Amino acid sequence: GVQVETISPGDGRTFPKRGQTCVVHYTGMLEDGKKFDSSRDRNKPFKFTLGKQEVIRGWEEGVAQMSVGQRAKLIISSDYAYGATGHPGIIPPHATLVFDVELLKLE
Amino acid sequence: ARPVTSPGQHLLAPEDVVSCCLDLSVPSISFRINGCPVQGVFESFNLDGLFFPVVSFSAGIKVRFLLGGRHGEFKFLPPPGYAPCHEAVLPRERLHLQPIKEYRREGPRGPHLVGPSRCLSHLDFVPCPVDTIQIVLPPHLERIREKLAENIHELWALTRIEQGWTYGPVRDDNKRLHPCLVNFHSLPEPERNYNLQMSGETLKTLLALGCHVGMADEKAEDNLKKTKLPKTYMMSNGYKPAPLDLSHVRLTPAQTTLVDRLAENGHNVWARDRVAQGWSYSAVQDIPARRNPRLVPYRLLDEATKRSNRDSLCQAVRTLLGYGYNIEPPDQEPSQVDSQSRGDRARIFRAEKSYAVQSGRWYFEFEAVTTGEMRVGWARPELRPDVELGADDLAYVFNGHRGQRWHLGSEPFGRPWQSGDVVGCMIDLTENTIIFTLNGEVLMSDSGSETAFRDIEIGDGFLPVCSLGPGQVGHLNLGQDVSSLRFFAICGLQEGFEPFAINMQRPVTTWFSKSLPQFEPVPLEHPHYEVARMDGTVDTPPCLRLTHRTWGSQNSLVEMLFLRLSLPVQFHQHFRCTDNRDDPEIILNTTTYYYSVRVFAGQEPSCVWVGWVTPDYHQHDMSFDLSKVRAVTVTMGDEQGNVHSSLKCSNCYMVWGGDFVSPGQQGRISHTDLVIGCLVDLATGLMTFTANGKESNTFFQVEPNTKLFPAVFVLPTHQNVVQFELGKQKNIMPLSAAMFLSERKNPAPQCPPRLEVQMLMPVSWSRMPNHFLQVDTRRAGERLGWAVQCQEPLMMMALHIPEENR
Amino acid sequence: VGEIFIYWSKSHNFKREEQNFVVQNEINNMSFLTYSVQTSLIVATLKKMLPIGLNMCAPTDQDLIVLAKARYALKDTDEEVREFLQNNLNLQGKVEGSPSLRWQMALYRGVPGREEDADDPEKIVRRVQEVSAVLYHLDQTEHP
Amino acid sequence: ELLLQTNLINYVTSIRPNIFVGRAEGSTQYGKWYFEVMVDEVAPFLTA
Ligand SMILES: Nc1ncnc2c1ncn2[C@@H]1O[C@H](COP(=O)(O)OP(=O)(O)OP(=O)(O)O)[C@@H](O)[C@H]1O
Secondary structure (H helix, E strand, C coil): XCEEEEEECCCCCCCCCCCCEEEEEEEEEECCCCEEEEHHHHCCCEEEECCCCCCCHHHHHHHHHCCCCCEEEEEECCCCCCCCCCECCCECCCCCEEEEEEEEEEC | CCCCECCCCCCCCCCEEEEEEEECCCCEEEEEECCEEEEEEEECCCCCCCECCCEEECCCEEEEEECCHHHCCCCCCCCCCCEEHHHHCCCCCCCCEECCCCCEECCCCCCEEECCCCCCCHHHHCCCCCCCCCCCCCHHHHHHHHHHHHHHHHHHHHHHHHHCCEECCCCECCCCEECCCCCHHHCCHHHHHHHHHHHHHHHHHHHHCCCEEECCCCHHHHHCCECCCCCCCCCCCCCCCCCECCCCCCCCHHHHHHHHHHHHHHHHHHHHHHHHHCCEECCCCECCCCEECCCCCHHHCCHHHHHHHHHHHHHHHHHHHHHCCEEECCCCCCCCCCCCCHHHHCEEEEECHHHCCCCCEEEEEEEECCCCCEEEEEECCCCCCCCCCCCCCCEEEEECCCCEEECCCEEECCCCCCCCEEEEEEEECCCCEEEEEECCEECCCCCCCCCCEECCCCCCCCEEEEEECCCCEEEEECCCCHHHCCCCCCCCCCCCCEECCCCCCCCCCEEEEECCCEEEECCCCCCCEEEEEECCCCCCCCEEEEEECCCCCCCCCCCCEEEEECCCEECCCCCCCCCCCCCHHHHHHCCEEEEEEEECCCCCHHHEEEEEECCCCCCCCCCCCHHHCCEEEEEEECCCCCEEEEEEEECEEEEEHHHHCCCCCCCCCCCCCEEEEEEEECCCCEEEEEECCEEEEEEEECCCCCEEEEEEEECCCCCEEEEEECCCECCEECHHHHHCCCCCCCCCCCCCCCCCEEEEECCEEEECCCCCCCCEEEEEECCCEEEEEECCCCEEEEEECCCCCC | CHHHHHHHHHCHHHHHHHHHHHHHHCCCHHHHHCCCCCCCHHHHHHHHHHHHHHHHCCHHHHHHHHHHHHHHHHCCCHHHHHHHHHHCHHHCCCCCCCHHHHHHHHHHHHCCCCCCCCCCHHHHHHHHHHHHHHHHHHHHHHCC | CCCCEEEEEECCEEEEECCCECCCCCCCCCCEEEEEEEEEEECCCCCC
């Protein structure tokens, strides 16, 4: 894998820790640029707990790298994502995913 | 979007100062963020036009333009040699923030529809004085020149002393001291030589314009006397202006029209000389830097300076008349600007097709804010955007710029409007008639009939329609608020006519003729162009042939034709790192695809361009050559030198047939057909061309994931023009394999029904958004600069065609 | 003007004398406006003045005007048409039923000075009878 | 790639000062120009 590029800076001090809930807004696009998912569209932040394997490896590591209040672009390879199987109907097999992720707060 | 490295990278956030610098010499565009260099530049871009600062945005921003001087306080000093942009405001305009190519504008009574704007060209700033070097001054005019220089200097000094200029050793505006305020013979050599040259230039341009000048009275020269001037007009050194009196002389209107041309020519010659010397234009005068406020071509010059020059030249011609030389104005000669095609020049706004009315009596109003070219009336739903309103049978309109009624031609009708006049358009479909009223009075034809049109067949229906020429503004009132109509009560209410949108709970949707060229399928009934789908024989692949139906006949249409195949080939997301029988493994494993274009004998290859176009090509250029192609190099580098990437981006990749034309064959009609093959490697992003089986030097490189449409730009020269051959070569797959997934491993050439030829159409109907972003622009202050604010969100649901990326 | 036009429509001799006068004197009715019945000044001046007559009548009176025209087609005299309207005053159109009457009423009541109009049933019958007679005779004139 | 795609997008508009500069042979215009833009307020996500 996962590559992180800081779109906007964060506090730079608070970072997610294992077993700590992370609240984010994400917009997911395929490497071609086609959008397939976005929490801003649903208007509800996505909350997930690190270390529980609730999200894929790319989210795990990339969001662990990000700091509170930071907006970043995450590039996640197929191996670090749904991979060969993919997500039938949404993500084509063997696809790289690009996510615009803002880490709102930690709870 | 190409990422560019900069210290502390982040998306534009509050308290960020973006400094943009344009160097037109390289040419290059460079950026600085908070005073830190942005490690990336644009360069080698097209210079066919005028550049302006621009900021694009969605709702939810507040930004400020800092243009230097009094219109903005630069936070960071401009890089050496770069001028503040506020210096580029033209003499006749005041600096302000404006939208770009708006077709709609808010108004007091309601929204205003706006026609296309007139844009200056980069060539409009090139002074073009008439060629006078060929003319040789007759001696009688030479002697008059000798005195004309002095007399012009006398008038100059008279004006200077009248406005308060006084003599001095050095020239300074505040001191009001002028060194050249001396006798002409005592004038410094350079200025005196320039004055003599200009005085001779006046006579020489008089001759050049076609005017005739010839001595009439010798005694007039001896009769002329210089006017005595008072001691106040007498100069500190002792010099006195001595302009010869011309109270007796009189000027004809034609002579004044000629004086206007003389002043324009003189100013243009002066501007050309100063440009040659190295001067340039600036809103603020800087003599040490060779920047002048008046160094612009005459047409763009300020009104006051124009009047001053006209007065000077009128006095000069008066001096010639006083000397007695008869001057014969030359007759005006016809001249047509033909700047743009009239059919596509005017923007047409119509009601949506679903609002067409097939019965009843309907009324609406059109207020003409300007007095220029505007048409208003009723159009049928199938109205074409390229054709002018009323030129065909689709629309019945009124053009009150000159007072004509337009339907299948123009006839005199009514009278022209002035500014603010309201034209009420009325359609009675029970009587099949159309009526036009100006300011509540029914316009009458020459015969005296009240109805403008008669015996109208209902057909599909009728829709309100207007057409605005360049620079015109009109307010269309469809009557949703009946009290808003100004003359409905005076005329129309009692006659039973009803407002068009009287009982409509929402504003009527409108469609305007957008002038963005678009690729559309060739019509199956096109009068001039025919496309034939030919099956692939044993020795021939599938083909799409273009033929000119009307070649070599009256009404034939010969113009540049831009053609593309409907389906694109898309390059792979990731590029590879670093007999005549196909080999079963190479053909299956190859990523190269090939398609050819056959230019038929009799079609000049010099008029054919063959290649590919991205989904972004929108140039309907009548005079097209490869120089017109858009192209820009984006260069990423390190914080010091060390260029890292030099990518080139363009929308058109093509080769000219003149390159493959043999030098001996050039200038002669060729019996042979010319086959230009194009190969694309979808894995390596490399594009190559072959001519008659010979590799060409031209080659192109494209970034991964690029979409490319096979394309041909041709100026027809024969009944048979070109043929898209969708074939293949040894170990190169056909084009259908790239286009279609199901045929990705099929080496047999195919031309499925979806694949077809499409031609570039100049204009197309486009829906006008019901709501528009509210942008507030205002000058915050002398130091704060100008300010743009947009705070109210506005969204739309967009339907996207995957293949066309539109 | 409507009374004069009504006399023109009723009397055949008036029409023939107007036709003669214009023909012998070579008058130019087209020049006057800027022969055929349309060019006739008697009908043209009415056509010009009629919008004021319609302005008198309120939009509710459209049905009553239609009925009065029907009576004039029945050839009823003006007084008995007046009595017919007087006894049938209730039939005046209902604004609620038709949307058009709503936006017509908007303008009619918005224009100052006409709020007092329609207050008097005698006034209503006056205006309806007059405008109906004028419209009826104009219909006969325009019919070939 | 086959079915038409739909999505909600923001409206975007452009604003310029009435300043036009270009290069041509014999032109009267200067070749180097410079300006600045200061960002006072920005909402990263006013909409989706
Ligand atoms: N702005 C102008 N427009 C038209 N003609 C001009 C202009 N400036 C100069 N000329 C021509 O050149 C002559 C100027 O001569 P000269 O070189 O002696 O003037 P200068 O003192 O250098 O000018 P300035 O008045 O700008 O100080 C004018 O008489 C006219 O012939």
